[PDB]
Design a protein around this ligand. Structure first.
Ligand SMILES: O=S1(=O)NCN(C2CC2)c2ccc(F)cc21
Ligand SMILES: O=S1(=O)NCN(C2CC2)c2ccc(F)cc21
Ligand SMILES: N[C@@H](CCC(=O)O)C(=O)O
Ligand SMILES: N[C@@H](CCC(=O)O)C(=O)O
Ligand SMILES: [Cl-]
Ligand SMILES: [Cl-]
Ligand SMILES: [Cl-]
Ligand code: NA
Ligand code: NA
Lengths: 253, 253
């Protein structure tokens, strides 16, 4: 039976290169553990392939082409995307997702001890720049929002796109550390970053409420199978333990 | 085009009889508002029908028959279940769910000011009885659990099933108020109850992590359409406002 092609992306602590290797043995992380569990529960073999363009996925406003892992699924170049891939309405129109394996919301990463306490605080000023990962779900949330605060924030990011939209979460984190910049990013990843770097904090609450799911091409029979496996891992307490395994850090004052 | 048959159940603040009426105009609540929004977004007409047996749904261990709203969907007697219907692995094997419109977890409802602080505290004693809604998702969670604490709790409830499993959340709440009883119930409904009755509180944290979704017969084309509509309502901020509309209460000290 055919080995499934699994697209994914480098993103700590979900997917990393092991430090030390060939094939699937090159990789470790939460999403690699989830994939292995799914493969033994459902009985498939698989080949992990990092997405060539290093992107999560968004639709181009000029020519309508998608990029990233979403494009890989639209083109049926991969069977599954096992990654921190956010479930969103624009994506469900073109690909399918399993039920979520982790909850998250957009929030703000910044330095500690400042007067900035919300997105509104950022929106009403320009001295502190702010942005998001290019061609990801956070960017697309702001681009499409009709909520006043977030529409104003998108107008700001779009006018400085070259400078404030970054290629990766790692680049956004480094920009917070090296410039007066607040980074719009997902709360799960904020939690990981802030337990390891005590200079950094979440600002405000969660701006939306969604989850990560395993992506498939639309209509794939694997979507329902993976859903059932994820729900069982959740109920058995195994998803919680997988999160505890990878969200570890010395902690901060 | 055919009007969709929608099964639901009486459960404050999701579905209630208006206090004052015919047809769909008899009903109000969060899930009635969600249904109306879905009907205008997707363009369908519908007829609300309360589930005849007053149950959410579980599978009988002797004859394998389901009951409740789940059975209505298995038999294709309803197009949709729009209700506080928990997504679970046993149910996804037999029906389909949209993506979730609300998150919840199992927790404990009890009186304030006591030494009971967790499920473990309940499991290690018998003077305080405890139970759950019969033939709902919480009951089925305990019945199937291999987690030591919850397996012990199921052994206790099953041996006193006649007395500690109740027909409705309302009956469980009243049992907390009139007897030395702790009620295993969903955190969303706990939040509503505890902002209105200052004698009551959540004990401990969330025991699992799941959500409510719109149920459909397996394979229905409405599942994906409803998912996309729910995701848009979430992103636009409308699901949050719908929750604020119905989770209102004078509050407590
Ligand atoms: O993106 S979803 O599938 N649908 C929206 N929700 C919000 C609870 C409405 C959530 C909440 C938690 C999730 F894990 C996933 C989702
Ligand atoms: O029942 S689900 O579709 N899958 C399990 N999860 C837990 C995050 C793993 C969640 C979390 C929040 C939801 F709203 C739904 C679900
Ligand atoms: N996880 C996001 C990428 C990171 C972000 O947008 O903050 C996605 O699925 O597109
Ligand atoms: N909402 C539950 C019923 C209440 C409960 O089990 O606590 C269900 O879908 O079965
Ligand atoms: Cl690769
Ligand atoms: Cl009725
Ligand atoms: Cl789904
Ligand atoms: Na889809
Ligand atoms: Na299903």
């Amino acid at each position: 039976n055919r080995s499934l092609i699994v697209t994914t992306i480098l993103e700590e602590p979900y997917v990393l290169f092991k430090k030390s290797l060939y094939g699937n043995d090159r990789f470790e992380g939460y999403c690699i553990d989830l994939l292995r569990e799914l493969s033994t529960i459902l009985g498939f073999t698989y080949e992990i392939r990092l997405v060539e363009d290093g992107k999560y996925g968004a639709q181009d406003d000029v020519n309508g082409q998608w990029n990233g892992m979403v494009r890989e699924l639209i083109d049926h170049k991969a069977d599954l995307a096992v990654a921190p891939l956010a479930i969103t309405y624009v994506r469900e129109k073109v690909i399918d997702f399993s039920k979520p394996f982790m909850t998250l919301g957009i929030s703000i990463l910044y330095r500690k001890g400042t007067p900035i306490d919300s997105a509104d605080d950022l929106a009403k000023q320009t001295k502190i720049e702010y942005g998001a990962v290019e061609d990801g779900a956070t960017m697309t949330f702001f681009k499409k929002s009709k909520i006043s605060t977030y529409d104003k924030m998108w107008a700001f990011m779009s006018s400085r796109r070259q400078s404030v939209l970054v290629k990766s979460n790692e680049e956004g984190i480094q920009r917070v550390l090296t410039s007066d910049y607040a980074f719009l990013m997902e709360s799960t990843t904020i939690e990981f970053v802030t337990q390891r770097n005590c200079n950094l904090t979440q600002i405000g609450g969660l701006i939306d409420s969604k989850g990560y799911g395993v992506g498939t091409p639309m209509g794939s029979p694997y979507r329902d199978k993976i859903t059932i496996a994820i729900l069982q891992l959740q109920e058995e307490g195994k998803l919680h333990m997988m999160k505890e395994k990878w969200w570890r850090g010395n902690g901060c004052p």
